[PDB]
Every structure is written in C-alpha cells, then in structure tokens.
Amino acid sequence: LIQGELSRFF
Amino acid sequence: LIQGELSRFF
Amino acid sequence: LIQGELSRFF
Amino acid sequence: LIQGELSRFF
Amino acid sequence: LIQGELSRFF
Amino acid sequence: SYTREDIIRIAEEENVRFIRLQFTDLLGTIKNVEIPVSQLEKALDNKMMFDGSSIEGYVRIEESDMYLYPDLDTWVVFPWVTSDRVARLICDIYKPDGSPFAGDPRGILKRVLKEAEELGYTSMNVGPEPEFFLFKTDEKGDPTTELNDQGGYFDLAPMDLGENCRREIVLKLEEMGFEIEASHHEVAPGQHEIDFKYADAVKAADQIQTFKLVVKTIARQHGLHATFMPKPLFGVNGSGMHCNQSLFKDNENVFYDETDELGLSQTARHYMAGILKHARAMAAITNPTVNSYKRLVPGYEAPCYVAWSASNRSPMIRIPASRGLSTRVEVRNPDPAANPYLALAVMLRAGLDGIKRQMALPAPIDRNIYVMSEEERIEEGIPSLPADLKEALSELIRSEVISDALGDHALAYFYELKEIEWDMYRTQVHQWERDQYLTLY
Amino acid sequence: SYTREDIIRIAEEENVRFIRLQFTDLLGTIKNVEIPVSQLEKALDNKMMFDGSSIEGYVRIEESDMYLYPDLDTWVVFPWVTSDRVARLICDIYKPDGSPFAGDPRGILKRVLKEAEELGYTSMNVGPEPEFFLFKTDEKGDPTTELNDQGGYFDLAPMDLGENCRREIVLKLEEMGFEIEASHHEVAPGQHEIDFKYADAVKAADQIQTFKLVVKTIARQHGLHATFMPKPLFGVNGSGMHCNQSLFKDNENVFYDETDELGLSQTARHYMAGILKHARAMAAITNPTVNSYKRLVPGYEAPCYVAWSASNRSPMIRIPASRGLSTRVEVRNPDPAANPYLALAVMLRAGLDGIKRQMALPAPIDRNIYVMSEEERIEEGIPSLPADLKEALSELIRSEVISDALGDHALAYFYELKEIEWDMYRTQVHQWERDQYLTLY
Amino acid sequence: SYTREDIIRIAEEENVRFIRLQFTDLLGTIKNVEIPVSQLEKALDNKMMFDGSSIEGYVRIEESDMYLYPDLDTWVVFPWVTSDRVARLICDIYKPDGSPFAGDPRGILKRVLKEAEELGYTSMNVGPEPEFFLFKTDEKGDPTTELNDQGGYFDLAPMDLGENCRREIVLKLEEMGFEIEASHHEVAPGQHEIDFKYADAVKAADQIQTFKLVVKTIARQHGLHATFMPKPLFGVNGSGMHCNQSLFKDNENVFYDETDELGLSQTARHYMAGILKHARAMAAITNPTVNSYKRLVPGYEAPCYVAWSASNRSPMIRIPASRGLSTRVEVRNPDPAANPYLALAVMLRAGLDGIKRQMALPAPIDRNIYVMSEEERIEEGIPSLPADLKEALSELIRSEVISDALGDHALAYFYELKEIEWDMYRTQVHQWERDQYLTLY
Ligand SMILES: NC(=O)CC[C@H](N)C(=O)O
Ligand SMILES: NC(=O)CC[C@H](N)C(=O)O
Ligand SMILES: NC(=O)CC[C@H](N)C(=O)O
Ligand SMILES: [Mg+2]
Ligand SMILES: [Mg+2]
Ligand SMILES: [Mg+2]
Ligand SMILES: [Mg+2]
Ligand SMILES: [Mg+2]
Ligand SMILES: [Mg+2]
C-alpha cells in the first residue's frame, strides 16, 4: 500500500 | 499524407 | 510491406 | 563573356 | 570542349 | 465582469499592444492567435477568421475557416509583459454559418452544461487539485532528472526548497485574478500543489489552463522546469488532478441531504453510480496519454479500481467530510495532462446519465485493502480501470453515452490521435528491454 | 498620401540624412541607389540616372541609362536608423526618352493593371500570406541548421520562442505604416506567419518587399537568421505565399453573387478557370527557384495538382468561406521567393484571359484524396504542376498568354537567368549521391 | 575447363574450406551463399535452395525458393585467403520445377545469346574498358574526398602514385586466371583503367564482376578506397565502361567486309543502326543510377548525343581503326555502375533488332562539334540521351523491344527499384540549394 512515502529510506 | 504533421514523433 | 528493406535510404 | 558577373555560383 | 582536361591549371 | 467599452478602456489605459485570442485543441494544448491592439474592435465584433482545423492536432486533413468569439469575462493582462503589455481573451470557435463548431472542447462543455440545465441544474461547481513537479534545468535550458528539492508531505523549507517557486506563482495568480485557497508540498520530492476556490465548470477549466501556463512561465523564469506529466519518474508518486464536483439548483446544493445518514441526497448517489459505471469509458479522456497509465499502478495513492468510499487508500470516488453547501463528490482518476473541458464534460455527462436512469449506487468499499485476489474482486463486483491506453480507447469506442458527450466529430479525431500515439509507442524498443536482454539472450 | 513639399518638410523635420531610391530586379531582389538629402529635390524632379541594366541580374550584357521616378506615396523613414535618419522611396524605371522601361517588374504589373482597367475593373485587391523560418546563427554570424524553437501550429510561446522577435517585427511594421491583420506560429518548427490587411496590387507587392527586408533586419538584430527559402529543410513543411485576390469595379466586389449556390459570380468562375488553364505556364514565375519544386511534393499541404476546391488537402485554388465584399480566390502555388510584381501580374493576366474567352470552370475536387492512380488522374482531367524548373521553363516558353504579360524584353532575360541557374544546378554532384554510391559501387 | 571430379580434386588438394556460390541481383551487386567444403558435392548436384527473392533487391515482396546451378568453368580460388582457402562458383538461378528463373540477369543474357544463335551468330565477343577512382581513407577506414595521386593521361609515377594499386591488382588478376591487356592512368587524378582481352559475353560479364570485387579488395588492403561511381567529383572526368562488341559466326567476324570503304559489313551497319535507334530506351539500363546522368554532360568526353563516328569528341558509337578479325563496334554510354549482364543483353538485343528489320544507318557525324544550336541538332536528326533517370525510365517503359529483352518479371522490379530511387532523390534538399538560397531569399 505504501511505496512512494517510504522513498526516504531508499 | 500528414507527413510533416507527424514530425513530433520523429 | 517493405519497411526494414528500405533502410538503405534512411 | 559576362563571366565577372557569374561569380555567385563560383 | 576541353573542361576536365584543363583541370591542371584549376 | 466586462463589456466592449470596458475592454477598450483598459486596453487604452494599460497601454496594451498585443492581444492573444486563446483557444484549446482536443489534446488540451493552449493555442492562440496574436493580435495587435488596432484589431481589438474587429476581434470584439466576432469577425476574426482562422484555420480552425488546428483543433484536430496533427491528424487534421483539410483547412477550414472558423470565427473566434472572444469571451469578455476572460480578459486579463499578463504581469510579466512589463514594457509592451500583452493581454488575452479566451474565445469560442464558430462556423461561418453562425453555429458553434462541434469540435471545440469549450463548446462541448457548454453543450453538456446546457443539457444539464435542461434537467433543472443551474450550475456545476468544480474545484480541481492539480499537482506538478519542478525539475532543475541545465545550461542549455533543458530539464534534467534532478528534482528541485527533497521535501515531503506538507514539509516546510523556507530558504529555497519548501516554497521555492510556489510563493511567487501564488502571488502572480492573485494579481491575475485567481482565488487561491492554499498551497503545500506534495508527497513526492519536488512535487507541489496549489488549490483554487471553487468556480463554475467553464471558469474552472479556463483557470486550469491559465494556471498551467502561468506555472510553466514562472518556473522558467527561475531557471526551473515545471511539468504536469502524470508520472515523470518511476517509484515515486504521480501527479493527479482530482476534481471536486457538486450540482447546484439556484444556490441550493442538490447533493446535500441532512436526513441521510451520510448527508448525501439520492441525486448525489445517482450521480456517483453513473460516474462509476462509465469510468472505464471515461478513462481514455481523463487519462489520455500513454504515461497516464503508469500512474494508475498500486501503491502510490492513485486509484486503480472503480469503487467509492469515504475513507480508503485510493478510491475512484471519495466523499469529503464537508457537508451543507460544500458537500462534494471527488473524482480522482484525472491527471493534469487531461483536457479540462473534455474531462469535466464526460464526468458531468456520466453523472447526468446516472441521475436520469435512477441508477443504484453499489456498496462502498470498507477498510478492506485490495490485497484480495482477483477472484475476490470480481466476486464482489469491483471493476478495474484500464491497464493501458489501448483498453481505454476500445472502451471509449464501445461506449454510447460519453461518446455522445464528445460528439461525432470530436470522437473520430480524438480516437485517431490516440491510436496514432499508441501505435508509435508500442513499436519502440526501450532501454529496459536492452538492459534485460541483449546479454541474457 | 504625400507631395513634394510634404516630403521636403518631413525630411527637414526628421533630420533625414540619406535616402534610398529602391527598385526591384527580375529576380525579386531589392536594389537601391543611396542619396544624400541635398539631392532630394533632384530625385523628386525625376532626373536621377543609373545603370538600369542591373535589372537583368548577372546576365546583363551592356550598360544602359535609365531614370528613377520615385513614388511619393511610398515614402517612409526607417526606425532603426537612430542617429542618422535614413528614408526610402520606391521608384519606377523610365527610359531617357520618357517612356517606362519595359523590363521593370513594377511597370509590368502597372501595365497589366492598366489593361485590366480597360475591361472595367478599377482595382485588384490582394492579400498575401508570406511565411518564413528563423534559424540560430553561429559566432561568425552565419545561419546554422538549428531552428529557433520547436513549436507547432498556432502554438503559444510567451517566453522568447514563437513571439518575441515576431512581436518586434509587428511593432516595427505598425510604425512603418503596415496594417497588420494577425500573426501566428506555423506548422513546422521555427516557422512563423504575419498577415497584413488587403491592399491594391502595387501596394501589396511593395509591402511584401518591405516586409521581407524588415523581417530580415529585425531577425539579424536579435542574433537570428530569417529566410524565405521555399524548402529549407527536408521532411518539414515549406514556406508558401498564398495570394488572395478579388477584382473590384468601383468599390463593388465583382466576384460576389448572392444568387449563386457558392456565392460566386460568373466573372469569378471565369477568372479561376483562366488561372487553372495557364497554371503550368505561370509555375516558372510563381515558383522561380530550383528549391521551389522541392516544396511542391505531396504530404506537406503544398499544391501539386492544378485543381480548385472549397475544402481539400492542398488544392491549387482555394475559395475561403467569407462572402460579400470579402469573397476571394486564393492561389497557393507561389512561394515567398517569387517576385511579387511578376507573380501578381501573371496571375491577373491569366485570370483576365480566362474572363475574356469565357472559359468553362472544371468541376471542383471533392474529399477524394489524390491517392488515386495516374490513370485515374488523367482520366478525370486533373493536370499536375511541373516537377522541376526545367519543365516550368519549357511551359513558359511555349505559352503565348503570360509571356505577353511578361513582355518580350523581360521574358528573354528571365529565361536566360533561369536556364543558367538550372544548368549550374544539374551538373552538381550532391552529398546524397556520394552517400548512396561510392560504397555500393 | 573443369569437371565435378576436377573440382573435388582441387578442393581436396588446395585445402579449400569455404565455397562462395556467387550470383547477381538486378542492381549488379554481387550476392553469395557461403558453403563449407563438406557440401561441395551437394552444391555440384544442383540441389541447394535459397530465397531467390533477393534478386529483386529492396522491393522484394515475398520469399520464394530457387535452386543454385553452379557453372563449373567459373571455379577459382582467391589468393588472399591464405590460411583457410576460399573458392567461388558463379551459379544460375533455377525455379524448383526445373526451368531457369526469368528474373536472373545471367539467364537473361543467356536467353538473348540463344536467340542470337537462332539467327546464326555463334558468339558475341565483348571487351570492356572499366575505369575506377582511388580515394584515400581516414583513420576509421572511410573514403575521404582526396585522390590518391594527381596524375594525368598515361602518366608515369613509379614511386607510389602512377601504379600503386594497379600493379598489384594486375598481378592478382593474372594469378586468378585473367588475361590482362594493358593498364594506364586515366584523365582525372586518381583514375585508372585496366583492360582485359576479349571474351564471350557471359565470360566478359563474369570477369567484370570479379574484376570489380578484386579491385575493391586490393584497394582496401593498401588503405585506399576504390569506387566505380560514374561521377564521384564535379568538374573532373567520370568513369565509363566502353563496351567493344563484334558478332561471330564460326570464328568468322561478320562485322568485317574488305570490299567496304570503311571495312564494315552490312550486318555491322544494321547492328549499329539498331543500337542507335533504341539508345534512349537502353539508357535506363546502361546508365542505371542518378549519378550516371551527371557524367553525361558536355566537356568530359562522355557521350551526350545519339550518333556514331570514327573520330569525334564523344560519339555514342565509335568504330576503332582495327580491321580483320578485330573489327569492333564500341558503345560508350555504359558506366561501371551498370549491370554487365543486363547491359550486354540490351545492347545485343537492340543490335539484333536492327539487323532483323534492316534499319538504315544514319550519316556519321563529322568534325562538326556540337556547338550548333538545338535547331541545328534536330534539323540534322541528332537525338540526345536522356537528361536524368526519370526520362530514361519513361523511355524504358515506352519501349517494346528492349523491355522484351528484359522480360516481364525483371522489367517490373527494375522499374520499381529505379522509381523508388528517383523519388527518394528528387525530394532531397541539397547543400547547393542552401548555398544559393537561405541568404538571398
Ligand atoms: N493526495 C495525495 O496525497 C497525493 C495524490 C497522488 N499524487 C495522486 O496521484 O493521486
Ligand atoms: N498549414 C498551412 O496551410 C501551411 C501551408 C504550408 N506552409 C505551405 O507551404 O503551403
Ligand atoms: N578519354 C577517355 O578515354 C576517358 C573516358 C572518360 N573517362 C569517360 O568516362 O567516358
Ligand atoms: Mg494532492
Ligand atoms: Mg484530493
Ligand atoms: Mg499559412
Ligand atoms: Mg492560406
Ligand atoms: Mg578510358
Ligand atoms: Mg574506349
């Protein structure tokens, strides 16, 4: 469900 | 026809 | 029908 | 004959 | 008409 | 408002030297005819002829002759003109016989609004939420792949990152006559959103066009590049153009019903049902580009299934908590690349078709995330949006309701444009294929 | 208008120091004799002698003596002169005996207009549509192969692409006295069009010459290169100079006929039939260069067949939808490289010849695209325009109607010039040949 | 000569590992099917199938199946193979039913020779004079515009300029089985000519193909580029392939007649009359490329008019002073870019058609150089060769004699190929046009 929000770790 | 019209893809 | 054959002019 | 004028092509 | 023959001067 | 004498008065007073007679083609691009101020009276007399076949885009076949009918209420003077003032007028396209051109998107929206008024609905109140990305340019002035900042949702970086090219855009729009609600940083890095106050449908679409033009110009001024591409980068959030809609009948919100459990009238429910049934047919208009369907992928808040909810990860239709005169139906499919006139027209026509047939609203989707299998999804009757432009075009062709909204002339040319675009796209060999293959095989 | 005393008054008031006595040669190039203001009275007395053989171009054989007869109505002061004001006057060429020179293109157009007036047509109203390309220059100031922008038809570019230079040209032309109708971006990138209001034929040709000069100067000022070359690039649209014509008899449009189905009088139909009959003969004048026939190829809206229509891909003659006093016949063969005086003269002469012999108008071509075979084309009696300069020259020589329009002196020199040009072109070995061959053979 | 057992014997002895089954397409290009030595017996049994549609060039529409019938007399082993010996065989194309393919140029020449034998002429003795240019290459190995030397007619520069890649080519050809007559420097810098002894028509064409291949390979070995392009440079002499022909009937030269004033039999005069009558029709075959007609311009000894003489600047047909068994008719139109089989076939067919109808020989052209006007030329009945490929193609289509020589299948495909080539060429915008225009207009 969440992918673009977790971009901070990537 | 439309040869010069399709120049945006070329 | 002949497109890839006419590549010599292109 | 009129060669001094044909310099535009040369 | 000698044109290509006179190429030595040109 | 404005009148002919008023327009002439400001033109003389403001020292306007050049006037842009703006119109829009089927792809949403802003086209114009430049005019010296000495031709202002001729323009205001609805006597200017132009090709008119430029609406069809690159699939136009023959040159026509059409008249520009400027809308006096759309007059505005650009603030950056400085030395030689430039003004603009948004015009409707008319055939030489006097009837409006059937292929003009603004005329299409006006016709749909007229047939809405025929049912007693005075106006359609629309508030859009367009989002855009800011990219850094190179020495040659071309966009690079680097975002202007690395902020997050509602972040605040006053120096040069959080606001950046958002304060001056809002200031210029306010000077231009816009009613700005609020601005904030969007979820993805380099992504920003500016919201307007609600207006009537035609005014809302005109404001969307002007907003895109102004944002692009101001971003170019600061050495940046502004794009309304639906999905400029892989793995980050895309840009949407959520449209909030409410039908009005003489300053009365017909969507409101205090007696209803959700505060929704039967008219609103029929509207939502009509939009839901015709969603797949509308997708080719609200999501017109090939890149539009790279946004419609799970995990980035973009809708991927045809369903409605009051609270969900990404429903097709969302109902905001506001009630009373501000009860609205939010449709989240459109991206900023869509033509505002055509998108509003097809959404309104689908809603009116739902209203006319007393269509039954399906049950809302609860907090049940769509991790359920496809068997569960079609068992519960949850349709899915088209996976690419080809499916959307096929659904558009098969549809008899929103094809009528487009009309016979515009449908054929839009279909030709999109078919050509898809055909050019599908035969390309992309770098991804050369990365996967060319070594393994 | 102006008078001798008026001209002297402005010359003293404006501090004009230098005067250009402008004229045109057979190739359309603008030639001039520079004059100090102290010789203005001598110039206005029609007493200035010059070579006059410079009209023939590079095929001039002997020096002559000819007088310059300035036209007082053509007076104008250039705006960019700044420090030392420079003015211009357009002059007619007269033999020393007092008769006008038969080889002067302006005199040729005047003579054709006189023989038109002999039939009762007081004036010929002409509106041209010249298109041009803008190229970026290098450090040395030479045109590169890169366009100034990448816009499309009627595209909007408020930064410095489509407009900017275009706006400056329009502003300068307005000062000069040019009544500008409208300006816009053309189909091909870097291509622009500026339209003037309609004027009499001589004034229209003078305005075309002045417009070309002004556009070139202003483009050079901004570090750009403006060209009116018919086909500067392969694969993109060329530049045309569509000429709109209407015959007038005492401010009455003789082309108009309300009773006709198309609103076209028998005079207009005879005019169009005459133009169609002599089209192949006029091709050498309206399309004078070798590059002119690289534009006349299918797929780029340039006409390739001698036919007329009200709506088609690319008819030779198009009839705009406007009626009343604005009913017009648009001829689309000419390119901006053509001599305006000679082109207008031959077109008017062909139309008058059609009127005199009462030629029957052939049937218009429908939406039947010319994908039909050559057998179908010559079965329906559709002629084709010449494929190159040689065919056009042969048709010019064989023609007895428009060769009379040119006259005996100008025809021989034009034929010599074009024959030399074609002979120089045909013996060249181009890079395309070295690319195809030199490896395969 | 050779036999199957002989071929196998040399293949085993010479350690031949690879065999080229060579054939020719309609454009004269050398095509081949590579074969391992283990398939030599299968090849010699006439059992190898290939596409066969490759003869048509780039206009082939469907894949066919055809057999290769090697000619055992054409066996040769290339000298530069060194480590792994490579041999070649020239093959005829046969349909699967057993009949020869009608589109094979070698079969076309064989059929014309057969119908010549039907009139009693046992053989046609042909000696060609192909000329070529040598260009210096760059680091990447591509031909530059600089000639390898600056010698003149019959010049002598022993060091690296005069012979250079002419001694080695002659040596390799001699080792290959050629009978070389002489070699010398040609008109233009970097132009060389090597002459072979006379042979039968099929052998002559095979030798021409092999000679072109060998010259190209050897020139590439020395870091040079060899081209048979008819006119690689403007202002210098082109390359021709003058063909000397004589008809033989049982080792008797039928062209010889001691009693005649010129030593020419009536058969030879009829042959020459037939060649002159059909010259414009044969031009599309003997001068097949666009660049071929840049050579056919006055002042460089290439023929430009259809006439014959014993001593002139550039006659179409020249008769050498040799008599007896060496009396010959030299046709000077062909350039080395022509297909040898097709050129010899059409020339022989035209000569035989002249013989059959007993055409009257026109009067020879004396030392009257063609400075005479066109009126003088068509008053004396002197035709001119086509000015470009389009005229030659039209004459080819209109001709019923040499189109029969080509046959129905080959004519259509040759016409399609040349039409496509001309259409591609005519729409190009060359640098010469951008030099003349783009500044003056
Ligand atoms: N509203 C948000 O949180 C962002 C929405 C998301 N950008 C979309 O494309 O729908
Ligand atoms: N869109 C148009 O009509 C442009 C016409 C085109 N440029 C020509 O040369 O004719
Ligand atoms: N003078 C000669 O023999 C050379 C012939 C010339 N190179 C040609 O192409 O015809
Ligand atoms: Mg948002
Ligand atoms: Mg929203
Ligand atoms: Mg135009
Ligand atoms: Mg036009
Ligand atoms: Mg020779
Ligand atoms: Mg010879």
Residue numbers in the entry:
A (entry chain R), B (entry chain M), C (entry chain Q), D (entry chain a), E (entry chain E): 2 to 11
F (entry chain V), G (entry chain N), H (entry chain F): 2 to 442
What does the paper say about this structure?
In Gram-positive bacteria, nitrogen homeostasis is controlled by an operon encoding glutamine synthetase (GS), a dodecameric machine that assimilates ammonium into glutamine, and the GlnR repressor. GlnR detects nitrogen excess indirectly by binding glutamine-feedback-inhibited-GS (FBI-GS), which activates its transcription-repression function. GS generates glutamine from glutamate, ATP, and ammonium by a mechanism that involves the initial phosphorylation of the γ-carboxyl group of glutamate by ATP and the subsequent incorporation of ammonium. The structures show FBI-GS binds the GlnR C-terminal domain within its active-site cavity, juxtaposing two GlnR monomers to form a DNA-binding-competent GlnR dimer.
To ascertain if this is a conserved mechanism among FBI-GS-GlnR complexes and to elucidate, in detail, the molecular mechanism by which low G + C Gram-positive FBI-GS proteins bind GlnR, we utilized single-particle cryo-electron microscopy (cryo-EM) and solved high-resolution structures of the Bs (1.96 Å), Lm (2.61 Å), Pp (2.07-2.28 Å), and Sa (2.15 Å) FBI-GS-GlnR C-tail complexes. Notably, the Bs and Lm GS proteins in the complexes were all tetradecameric, while the Pp GS in the complex formed 10% tetradecamers and 90% dodecamers and the GS in the Sa FBI-GS-GlnR structure was all dodecameric. Despite the differences in the GS oligomeric states among these complexes, the GS subunits in each adopted essentially the same conformation (superimpositions result in root mean square deviations (rmsds) of 0.5–0.7 Å for alignment of 400 corresponding Cα atoms). C Density for GlnR peptide and contacts with GS in the Pp FBI-GS(14)-GlnR complex (map contoured at 0.06 σ). Peptide density was evident for 8-10 residues of the GlnR C-tails from Pp (IQGELSRF), Sa (PINRGDLSRF), and Bs (FRQGDMSRF), and 5 GlnR C-terminal residues (QLPRF), in the Lm complex. These GlnR C-tails all form a distorted helix and bind within the GS active sites. In the FBI-GS-GlnR structures, each GS pore binds two closely juxtaposed but non-interacting GlnR C-tails as each pore contains two active sites, one from each ring. The GlnR arginine of this motif makes contact with residues on α15´´ and stacks with the side chain of the aromatic residue in the GS D50´ loop in the Pp, Sa, and Bs structures. Using electron microscopy, we show here that some Gram-positive bacterial GS enzymes can exist in a tetradecameric state and that this state is favored by binding to the master transcription regulator of nitrogen metabolism, GlnR.
